[PDB]
């Protein structure tokens, strides 16, 4: 399986208080896209054939 989020992601530190920290999603550079996954078609078909067998 391949899985990805194609979006380029910048973090940003935010100091909450004395010696504290917090990370948050800052800017997003590039194309606003959608995360996904892929598998091979015929392998999935053949493995389902095996399990149905």
């Amino acid at each position: 399986i391949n899985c990805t989020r194609p979006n380029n992601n910048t973090r940003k530190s935010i100091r909450i208080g004395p010696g504290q920290a917090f990370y948050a999603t800052g800017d997003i550079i590039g194309d606003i896209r959608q995360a996904h996954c892929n598998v091979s078609k015929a392998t999935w078909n053949e493995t389902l054939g095996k399990v149905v067998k």
Binding site: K12, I14, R15, I16, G17, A24, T25, G26, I28
Partner: peptide, 16 residues
């Protein structure tokens, strides 16, 4: 959001 100091408040944005 708070700051390092108590009397200072700040305006911060992010994405969710």
């Amino acid at each position: 959001m708070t700051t390092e100091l108590r009397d200072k408040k700040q305006k911060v944005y992010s994405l969710f």
